[PDB]
Ligand binder design. Structure first.
Ligand SMILES: CCCCCCCCCCCCCCCC(=O)O
Ligand SMILES: CCCCCCCCCCCCCCCC(=O)O
Lengths: 59, 59, 256, 270, 56, 256, 270, 56
């Protein structure tokens, strides 16, 4: 699916029971494949060290 | 860069309460995610980026 | 600009945001707090874990069905297996606490229903047979919701509790429970409800395992009614936050 | 320049909702970590210095090199000036639509013997010449052609064993800045060359040996290094994804968005 | 006609002089720290407040 | 009394009122304007048609389907056949302009969807084959929307542009396009979106036919999903208003 | 800075007892030689300067060297940066648990011919390149690989016959100081690599010839030299005893406490 | 923006100037003599007096 638009979409479906996991990914903004090609991902790869607070906005 | 010493953490998303949908409304939804750096963010030690490749000079 | 429908609560790490709700019923009007030194008894210095304790927990969500009678939890022992508040419970002879209960059940605009969230200090349940008393296993369960039973419980020689809803297990009128603090989850205009309970008890501090001083009850009055084709499964979820915990008399590990 | 402080916060119960917003406004929320949790007062002495544009674009980089010999077919090397014939520099300039800066050139020249049967080869110190030819000027077709006199054109004489030569150049563009990306044609009929190739006429750069230097053949290597200074920028944009192909145009070969991994839950890369 | 400035430290002065007649010969300026995020974040006409709902 | 959901824009004759929208993203923070005399070059006196030019135009509305990849327009040449702004484009060697883009797609509460309205200065599209370049006919069309293609374009000897969405034709990550100004049309909380673009270019003025400096893109991220029985056909419509136009160097009629 | 004075004293008879104390308190007695005997007033101009940390740790030292050739299998040399591959420097840093300082690098490069039958060998001036690669960066697997363009990574071009090159580096550690000794694993399960090897990721250092330089084979030698500056230290400790074995860990071979001698009374070493 | 200090003698001034913009480029500081043995010798809570018995 990385060759389609669906790479950016998170499926959410009505289940019959509660507590199922929607998704998860490690936090390694310069290494992990998730953030790798993101905007923040690119700028980091030029730099070795970083610190701060990453916001995650969901819609 | 990836190292086990400083490894960042984890992130998850769990159903708090199952999606409730009326009749005639679509069952499945989608959720898009965003990333940004707060105003305390900082970086250091510029380097090369492994992503971009090359073979011989472009023409 | 502002709205009364929306609320945001923050304790320690956790945070709970709700875009549809009502105000927050506070106790009898006493905002929870620490212990003033006028009423103190224990002469050891109390532990105040603060952020380690104060925060929100989420128990097991329980399904809600057309025939579902209701549910009850016992707060002093529910959390006992969760987090440091479960650990700091086992290692102390005394504790003092107050609870913020937050119940979350949402539905679309096409789902009828009404719930009742009451928080009952010292609910004392009867027994199936008249002579015996309930067993410690029946009144409680770890993090799990115990539920009522819609029709009378046949009385054998067992220790079972009396689960009839209309008596609410305490042998009172269920219609009268609103003297205690409460709120109405109503699928029409609401989504979630909230309660803040200060510390209520006869003595200034208490042991946690012996005496369960606060009971939580969710009783549907108007069952869930919806036309076919809409989603069937609507869970209810409860969130329970201790506030201003204190502890005394550190001892060895266990309860026995 | 310094990072902002993170201000402490106690508990909160209130109808003000920092944790909520609407991204549909195209507005990144300013929420700071003190809003959604409890926070202790902390002073940060971290500095944003090394993230400034100046330190980002200013490093020497090898754009290109050639080979010219002491005898035979190719006795000199000619190159038109574009940054885009080297991958890793071109990418660093594609963040910014409009860039402004003053080049600082540095050349690095080396010599290499070539296999031959010539007898009694005895070296002498070679001397390299590097001539710049602004556009439209005369173009030498042979090493001894009169153009090498350099009555005007800035030229540099260099010698092996000395330090690498260096010269600085000011801002040469016609407009108010260089343009990395240009959408349009060169001809009012929307025909001819498309893309940034039309804007770029920088002239040409040449090099030659001054003297034969020995009896045996010798091949030389020259290398150019840009070092932007005094940089200003405008209108940032997404970094490039697919590998480069041609130096005259943005043409690319379609490639996936990212690398892959196993099922969404999986916490490790593959 | 010298000038004095401050180095980059963490927990001093250096003397620089421009020797040439052309601006492009002066050394790079590494020290300009001025930053105003408002030109990318918050590009809206109506100023929005953090403490309030976005769409009221 | 007031609301943030509602907005009314008036330029010249036309007016656009919307009862559900978000704020108006303004450029990079520079409200468009005329040319100060410090940066001027052309020594002829500029024409300022004002109301004759500044006003809203409406291009051809384009259908939006579950599989629809997306669309792009080129602003400097779109309007060229419409109104005086099309006429005043052909008779001058120079122009300076800034754009207010207003995109309108509405749906009922039962229609899922999300769109992305970005306005990309100087979008330079690649070519199908690596050696050639796109033809002037493929990158443009009069008032008509050119659309992407969801899967890779086979590379022949043609001049066709590379229409893959995930590379967005520029060979970048489509997920990153938000650095440019944008807004989100979202069928949930929104109806229409708005952008204001000041004049961005390397040189203070420009020829209009040669150099298309501003590209508009609408890319759906979450396709249209709706249960049967609801209306199928949902169009998208674009509205484009020049602002503070100027012109110089009157010449004969044509482009060649 | 100066030595303290030794104050004079006459005879003494008194109940105050300087000469006695209790070492069980872990308290080194401050007694000065004037206490247990008679002493004349003496001024000392001796200075403790050369015993300061700065003069102790600051001397250039040869940590390591490699060999890379002009042709054949090995055309470049790669080395990860650790001080511990050289005996006498590593020991000087093992007094102090936590050290802080700013390296000053200096390279010394030499060339050597190699025996061959090649005819008409005529040298030219070689040019060495030295490239630093902070961690995680791209790793060249071949001399002509694109990575050598050094669009960013700090790199040095050097020439034979000139002075040895030198560059200074600031404090690169993440924490508040380098750590010489680290007790713990890299993994929360107490598994994997044990010891200081986990803390140390400094990146990698590379070198190559720029040009072949002649027809005949040539082998080169590079040498690195640290010169700590601005040093600060904490928590001193006992010097190391047994000979070193590995560079990744403190492993040692058991050896006696000291050398020996004859019977306790014997006044001379053996 | 020069500076003046004293050499190391026994029985004079030198003029130094920092030419670079980075602290790590400045010359080593050889002259800091500050010494306080109390952090290794005498690490006790109750201050002990030389002239008195240790354990009384
Ligand atoms: C010996 C004198 C040498 C002079 C070197 C002149 C080199 C000119 C550099 C132009 C810089 C980068 C510009 C890209 C041009 C464009 O695409 O518009
Ligand atoms: C050409 C640029 C060369 C740069 C040289 C960088 C060398 C880094 C030196 C690190 C120093 C001593 C550190 C030991 C590390 C550890 O064990 O934590």
């Amino acid at each position: 699916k990385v060759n389609s638009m669906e790479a950016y979409q998170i499926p959410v479906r009505s289940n019959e029971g509660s507590g199922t996991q929607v998704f998860g990914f490690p936090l390694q903004p310069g290494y992990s494949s998730v953030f790798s090609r993101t905007l923040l991902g690119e700028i980091l790869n030029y730099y070795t060290h970083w610190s701060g607070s990453i916001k995650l906005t969901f819609m | 860069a990836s190292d086990e010493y400083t490894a960042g953490g984890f992130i998850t998303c769990w159903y708090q309460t199952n999606i409730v949908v009326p009749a005639d409304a679509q069952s499945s939804c989608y959720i898009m995610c965003f990333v940004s750096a707060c105003n305390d963010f900082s970086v250091r030690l510029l380097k090369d980026t492994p992503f971009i490749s090359q073979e011989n000079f472009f023409q | 600009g502002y709205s009364d429908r929306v609320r945001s609560i923050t304790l320690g790490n956790s945070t709970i945001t709700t875009q549809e709700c009502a105000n927050v019923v506070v106790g009898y009007g006493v905002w929870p707090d620490y212990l003033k030194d006028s009423e103190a008894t224990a002469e050891d210095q109390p532990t105040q874990p603060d952020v380690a304790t104060c925060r929100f927990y989420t128990l097991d969500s329980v399904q809600w069905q057309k025939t579902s009678p209701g549910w009850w939890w016992k707060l002093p022992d529910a959390l006992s297996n969760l987090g440091l508040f479960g650990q700091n419970m086992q290692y102390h002879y005394l504790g003092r606490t107050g609870y913020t209960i937050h119940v979350q059940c949402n539905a679309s605009k096409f789902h009828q229903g009404c719930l009742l969230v009451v928080c009952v200090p010292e609910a004392e349940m009867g027994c199936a047979t008249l002579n015996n008393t309930p067993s410690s296993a029946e009144l409680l369960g770890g993090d799990t919701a115990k539920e009522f039973a819609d029709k009378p419980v046949a009385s054998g020689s067992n220790k079972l509790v009396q689960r009839v809803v209309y008596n609410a297990g305490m042998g009172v009128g269920v219609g009268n429970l609103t003297i205690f603090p409460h709120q109405w989850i109503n699928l029409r205009t609401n989504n979630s409800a909230t309660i803040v309970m200060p510390y209520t008890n006869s003595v200034p501090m208490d042991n946690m395992f012996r005496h369960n001083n606060v009971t939580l009850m969710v009783i549907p009055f108007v069952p869930l009614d919806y036309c076919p084709g809409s989603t069937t499964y609507v869970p209810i979820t409860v969130t329970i936050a201790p506030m201003c915990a204190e502890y005394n008399g550190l001892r060895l590990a266990g309860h026995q | 320049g310094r990072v902002a402080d993170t201000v402490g916060t106690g508990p909160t119960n209130s109808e003000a909702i920092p944790a909520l917003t609407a991204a549909e406004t195209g507005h990144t929320s300013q929420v700071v970590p003190s809003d959604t949790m409890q926070t202790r007062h902390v002073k940060n002495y971290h500095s944003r210095s090394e993230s400034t544009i100046e330190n980002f674009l200013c490093r020497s980089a090898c754009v290109y090199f050639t080979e010219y010999e002491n005898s035979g077919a190719k006795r000199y090397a000619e190159w038109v000036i574009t940054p885009r014939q080297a991958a890793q520099l071109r990418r660093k300039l594609e963040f910014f639509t409009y860039v402004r800066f003053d080049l600082e050139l540095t050349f690095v020249i080396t010599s290499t013997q070539q296999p031959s049967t010539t007898q009694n080869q005895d070296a002498q110190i070679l001397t390299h010449q590097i001539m710049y030819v602004p556009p439209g000027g005369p173009v030498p077709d042979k090493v001894d052609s009169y153009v090498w006199q350099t009555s005007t054109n800035p030229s540099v004489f260099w010698t092996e064993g000395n330090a690498p030569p260096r010269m600085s150049v000011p801002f040469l563009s016609i407009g108010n800045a260089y343009s990395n990306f240009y959408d349009g044609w060169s001809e009012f009929s929307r025909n001819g060359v498309y893309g940034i190739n039309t804007l770029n006429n920088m002239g040409t750069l040449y090099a030659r040996h001054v003297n034969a230097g020995s009896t045996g053949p010798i091949k030389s290597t020259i290398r150019i290094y840009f070092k932007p200074k005094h940089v200003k920028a405008w209108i940032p944009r997404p970094p490039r994804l697919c590998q480069y192909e041609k130096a005259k145009n943005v043409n690319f070969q379609p490639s996936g968005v990212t690398t892959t991994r196993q099922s969404i839950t999986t916490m490790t890369n593959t | 006609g010298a000038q004095v400035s401050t180095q980059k430290t963490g927990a001093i002065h250096y003397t620089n002089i421009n020797y040439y007649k052309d601006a492009a010969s002066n050394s790079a300026n590494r020290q300009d720290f001025t930053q105003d995020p408002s030109k990318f974040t918050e590009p809206v006409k109506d100023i929005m407040i953090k403490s309030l709902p976005a769409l009221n």
